[PDB]
Design a binder for this molecule. Structure first.
Ligand SMILES: NS(=O)(=O)c1ccc2c(c1)CCC2
Ligand SMILES: NS(=O)(=O)c1ccc2c(c1)CCC2
Ligand SMILES: [Cl-]
Ligand SMILES: [Zn+2]
Length: 257
């Protein structure tokens, strides 16, 4: 099916997912000079103290660290958000080289990777109903640059060997996502979509300005994962990112000046 190869990559998605050429597609380039400070934005609130991770899964496109969202534990609110958004999972997008990998770009600058913490609007009951609403999801995006190692990411890195191929999963409890956040919560926000099929336009994007630093060794291990399933020819899981899409009739707002 869809993927990131020459014959099933981003340029092919529109054939089965026409919304790929929609009016609010993601990711987008963040023109820092065109972005405008928005005083109407409320303080951003990331409350991950009671987060309960459960499992990590290689879905053949990336790997998801899943959380128990049956109760209001890890939640995101404030900022441009109305109501409470519950954390369901996080994953990354990365490249084959340090010079590429992120989906969103800043003044056309591409980072080595990008972390996506996915949340759904609790006023819709569950994730399924949420993705049928224009404000159903909120994704917190964080850029990754190569430099010093990120201590809080190591536990994720060391379990990847157990989920090398598509379909494989492993227990992953007691992981604290607070260890993946940068110091500052300054951010840019705009209305967008899922960056992979089905590309649903139900997302409020909140992209942090400050990137986190991860070591070359850590990202190198991300690149050892496979897109393929067990027993199939090896196709390294790299460059699983979608390029910037037309901003069209949208404005990116900044939480700072
Ligand atoms: N349109 S899409 O979802 O990218 C897609 C789905 C299946 C297949 C191709 C492209 C090419 C080979 C088979
Ligand atoms: N890359 S993204 O926009 O964060 C994204 C793309 C697809 C899906 C989710 C999040 C949640 C379930 C399906
Ligand atoms: Cl390939
Ligand atoms: Zn993503």
């Amino acid at each position: 099916h869809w993927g990131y190869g020459k014959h099933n990559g981003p340029e092919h998605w529109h054939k089965d997912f026409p919304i790929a050429k929609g009016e609010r597609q993601s990711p987008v380039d963040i023109d820092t000079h065109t972005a405008k400070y928005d005083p109407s934005l409320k303080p951003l609130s990331v409350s991950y103290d009671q987060a309960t991770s459960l499992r990590i899964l290689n879905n053949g496109h990336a790997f998801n660290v899943e959380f128990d969202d049956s109760q209001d534990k890890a939640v995101l609110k404030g900022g441009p958000l109305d109501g409470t958004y519950r954390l369901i999972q996080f994953h990354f997008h990365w490249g084959s080289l340090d010079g590429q990998g992120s989906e969103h770009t800043v003044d056309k600058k591409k980072y080595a990777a990008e972390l996506h913490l996915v949340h759904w609007n609790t006023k819709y009951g569950d994730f399924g109903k949420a993705v049928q609403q224009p404000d159903g999801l909120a994704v917190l995006g964080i850029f990754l640059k190569v430099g010093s190692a990120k201590p809080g990411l190591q536990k994720v890195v060391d379990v990847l060997d157990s989920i090398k191929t598509k379909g494989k999963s492993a227990d992953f409890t007691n992981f604290d996502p607070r260890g993946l956040l940068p110091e500052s919560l300054d951010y840019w926000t705009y209305p967008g979509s899922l960056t992979t099929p089905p590309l649903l336009e139900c997302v409020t994007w909140i992209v942090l300005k400050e990137p986190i630093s991860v070591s070359s060794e850590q990202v190198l291990k991300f690149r050892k994962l496979n897109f393929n399933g067990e027993g199939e020819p090896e196709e390294l899981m790299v460059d699983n990112w979608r390029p910037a899409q037309p901003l069209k009739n949208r404005q990116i707002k900044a939480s700072f000046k």
